[PDB]
């Protein structure tokens, strides 16, 4: 991470879209460093819907400039998350803080 920051670190990482985001208010139950799956609060569970959201992390893959973009987890099973929370860190990020 950067030590002496300016306040843009959270925002840039989130809008960049390289990091994973909690699409719904939910709690975590799985980890494989390749996928993350979330159990969602009833208030956002839809009547004819599973009640769970799963994400697949992008792994080592050449960028347009020949650099890897692999994503990494930053959570644990059973851990709660608000909607919009940072789910998985990407390159040059930690806890959704821009870290060049």
């Amino acid at each position: 991470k950067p030590l002496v920051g300016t306040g843009m670190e959270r925002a840039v990482a989130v809008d960049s879209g390289v990091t994973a985001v909690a699409k719904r208010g939910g709690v975590v139950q799985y980890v494989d460093a390749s996928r993350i799956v979330i159990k969602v609060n009833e208030d956002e569970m839809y009547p004819g819907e599973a009640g769970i959201d799963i994400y697949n992390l992008t792994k080592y893959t050449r960028s347009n400039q020949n650099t890897c973009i692999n994503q990494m987890p930053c959570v644990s099973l059973g851990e709660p998350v608000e909607r919009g929370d940072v789910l998985a860190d990407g390159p040059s990020t930690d806890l959704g803080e821009l870290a060049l």
Partner: protein, 50 residues
């Protein structure tokens, strides 16, 4: 505010410190600037250009 934080820290409000030559163990003359800085690597490393 920075001065107070240094005092709250463990360093003089000036931030400069004495130092010693790693080769000879003798002290350098008067304090010098010692600090922690954020540093970046640019995508231009030598082997990719030589």
């Amino acid at each position: 505010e920075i001065k107070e934080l240094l005092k709250l820290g463990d360093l003089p409000t000036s931030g400069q410190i004495r130092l010693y030559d790693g080769r000879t163990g003798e002290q350098f003359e008067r304090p010098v600037t010692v600090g922690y800085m954020y540093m970046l690597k640019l995508n231009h490393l030598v082997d990719d250009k030589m």
